[PDB]
Design a protein around this nucleic acid. Sequence first.
RNA 1: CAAUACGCAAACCGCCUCUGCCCGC
RNA 2: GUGGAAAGGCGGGCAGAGGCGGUUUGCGUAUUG
Lengths: 275, 287, 263, 141, 121
Amino acid sequence: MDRRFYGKIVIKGKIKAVTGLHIGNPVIKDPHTGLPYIPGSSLKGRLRSLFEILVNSRLGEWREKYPSLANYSPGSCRPDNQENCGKFFNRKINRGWIHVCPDYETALACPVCRLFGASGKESNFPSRIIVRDAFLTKEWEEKWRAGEAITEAKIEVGIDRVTSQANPRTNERVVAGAEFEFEIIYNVENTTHWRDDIKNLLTAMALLEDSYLGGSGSRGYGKVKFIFDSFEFRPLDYYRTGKDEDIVSIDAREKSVSDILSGFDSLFSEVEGKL
Amino acid sequence: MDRRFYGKIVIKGKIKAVTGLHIGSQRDISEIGGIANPVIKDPHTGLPYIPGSSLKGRLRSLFEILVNSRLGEWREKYPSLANYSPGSCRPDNQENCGKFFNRKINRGWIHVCPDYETALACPVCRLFGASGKESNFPSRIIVRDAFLTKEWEEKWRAGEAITEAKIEVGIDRVTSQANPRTNERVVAGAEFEFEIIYNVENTTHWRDDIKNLLTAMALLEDSYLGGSGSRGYGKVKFIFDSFEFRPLDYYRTGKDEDIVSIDAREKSVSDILSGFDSLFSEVEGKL
Amino acid sequence: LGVMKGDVDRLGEFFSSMDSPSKLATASRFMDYFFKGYIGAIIEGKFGYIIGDVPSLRDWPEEPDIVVVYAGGDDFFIVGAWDQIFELAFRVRRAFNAYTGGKLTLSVGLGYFDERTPIYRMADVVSERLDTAKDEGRNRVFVVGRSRPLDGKHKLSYEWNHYEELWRTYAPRIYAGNGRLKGKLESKKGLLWKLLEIRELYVRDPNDVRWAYLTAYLLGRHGLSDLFPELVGIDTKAVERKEPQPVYWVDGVLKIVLMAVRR
Amino acid sequence: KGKQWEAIQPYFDNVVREAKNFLEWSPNKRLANAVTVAAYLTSQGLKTNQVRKILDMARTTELKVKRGEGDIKDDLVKMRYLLAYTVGKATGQSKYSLDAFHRILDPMLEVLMGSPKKENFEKFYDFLQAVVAYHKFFGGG
Amino acid sequence: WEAIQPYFDNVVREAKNFLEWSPNKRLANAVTVAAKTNQVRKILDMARTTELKIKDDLVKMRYLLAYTVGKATGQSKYSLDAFHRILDPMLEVLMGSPKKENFEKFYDFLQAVVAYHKFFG
RNA sequence: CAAUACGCAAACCGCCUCUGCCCGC
RNA sequence: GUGGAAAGGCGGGCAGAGGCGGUUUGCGUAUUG
Ligand SMILES: [Zn+2]
Ligand SMILES: [Zn+2]
């Protein structure tokens, strides 16, 4: 009921890998250009899975602010084959358990499912962020042309203990240092709660800079480092006049934890006057 | 009551699928081995294409919402928005409630004005079209099916692929249970030639009706065009070849006197930028 | 609007069997009272011991919506609700086959026409669907307008006993009653159109066996490998008899199940 | 079960090579044998994702038989060595399953280089999809 | 059986220029060619690199091909110099040649050799 | 005097579950 | 010196919503020719 639209907060920037990355033994590449790239589903489905786990521990602190967290106890439906019950992860996809609130008004009240979207039986609430693919940057487009290898290979081994039987394989990783260019657009639909979802999306990004991005990750295959460039707002009046009436937020040398921390409320101050 | 004709503003251009484009339609028609999520491909060539319904629908659904938000202040600009309130008719099964989204298709609610006189002033249905019992305002835009550009035909001749198979997986938060699948999507960077014809029926209101089409397009460049979309699969970008006016004196005579606007290397937001009075200035001389 | 028009066959040869005015006045009166009097008691919903179970989309209402236009003694013409006229034709034939001692048969030609249709065309098409079911075997029902090859081996209108087993096999496994489908076959009404597309490959080419594996695969992908075991495999008994394959007969038994749902 | 995989395969293999040309019989025989082809491939796993490159290779020139080219040389080259690359990349327990599927198609590919292009490859491609379709019906995909 | 391999050595010495055959001979060479995987992938995958891409790399593609046989000594030059003797007589031609065309028939020959290598073992 | 004996990956997981023609003559 | 004359089968509808290519496995050890 009552889908609305005030604007689209655009989060441009550049994903940096200080340590070498892997997606998936080749890293998948853009076919028309040959370059590897970080997809959309590996960056939206990774932030959701570092935010459904974060919400799982904290169902006492968010329940006073978010309704429809009282409808779940922090748990898992993996042993007990029940669809919607007290345990927090409710949808068996085919064999996996992903927290999706099964209604519009549950997902309207849910802190996860108002942002990363939610399916349902005759409800089907749709998302508010759209996360685009990340190709190489235009200064790193040219190292492919200059032959400076945008990728590499890696030979590991797997040691059987008794006979010391070496069982090697060849991982193929993106080389450490290669820099992509990501894109997240937040679809501002409800002016009552967008202070949350901008400080709530950066929550999922900040855990990702401590965690890994795709690949194995527990061995070195992560280390995202979000280099932001500029938030803009794109109001509804931007799409009628076509002006540069999009409020620029200055974050040329700031971190994901340096926006969500002190410094937030002065940056987004003109957007609040624009609501 | 009083349908006239003055010409047809033809918008020629090229849709550039910046990210993998996905539409999807039926599979298994006298066929066994597929990836089971195929983008609609026409049978005579076996190449993918962007349909007209998939582009007119997504230009519509991004322009219900803009109207649904600014419903309060546009009653003076456009009459017959005073029949409506922001919201859906979904909580109480009515084909005419106070809210905006009023017509039940099968189980979903899509705004269609019920009469010719009501839809004549409504900003949405005066452009994209309407229906009803006995009254039935018909559309003005003809969004035609878009096919690949002269170049990308030959990349199917030279041997380059046009569809890619992306493997995505689902993961349980507890047992890390991999739940994989495959998608057929258009290769990222392919390029389709669209054409959107605007049937100029009234010279009173075409300036405020071309601007609405370039508002629904300028939202579509920030949104996605069909497919999984929220995970990257849209990201489409209009590259305008030529605006052409195609006047009334064109159709009888055959003289090449059709007014051509200058849209060589301009964004969709740059037409609606201050200069829409200058791009379509010489159209005012013909009225 | 479900129009049916059926008549007793070989009746003029039957009244020449009589050999006295005592005998012909009786046989022309017992035959008279079936289509005059005892056809009213069938539509009122009686005689379950005599009839049994008919191919029926839903059980018979208290006040059925049937309009007997004409019924003469050799002939009848009955309109009504188009899925009760379907039920009535197998309910008239069943009661007629026990009124006579199994000796005379009906030939009912069923049509299905919209409300906005002039009657002079409805009687024209149905009487031609009658003579379709008359010249072939005189003991056979027309059910639905159905496409056939140009060979002559494939005759359209169903035999009465041959049809009422096609209802016993195909219908209680894909249909449950009252216009709804079986369990987990909902959200697969696109399937039964696709299954009637594979019947349309049998009509352009009867000699092709392209319909044999497409039958098996489409039941495989949808998980419905148990339904239609008669259609997944070819019948070597049906080839040597020069009779239609079991994908030819499935058109009329699917459409009645399909049209009873909103489709 | 697996006891059907031992008997029915050894009943069919001498019938397999003795009809090595793809234009064996356009009648009911090549569909009756094709069910028996998937009948001893039922008890094996027979995953399709490695075959998806081969079948799409059969798909992309199936349009090109249809007024695209009159030459299937460049395609059928690519089908021969990749199908040897199937055991040539994937070995193990899926290799013993995929050796029995190798021995039916490799007699038929060598026909197709010197074959007609409108004919005798349609008679292969119809035997292609008969193996896949019943395999979904006996419980494999 | 080395003479039948030496009978195939004349077939490797038959294809002096590039266009050996568009028919079954490139396979029939490669069946008898393939009648160690880990030593060749700096040419095998190096062929995969240069396909999408050039001329200064093909010298390195010829320099690494002699760098393989110059490394391994002892009993480890025999099939090394043999597999050396096939590829370079089809690569001495392809320096001054079309790149996207005229290489495919070797690029499909290079892949077909390792394909039957794993089948025969 | 210097090396060569051998290993190039095994697994499971492969789509899912919601919707399926109305309106007007 | 025509069972004729005039008559658009069509107006409205995005195949869409949800989904991490994933989890473990140390380029190594053993002895001589
Ligand atoms: Zn939720
Ligand atoms: Zn309207």
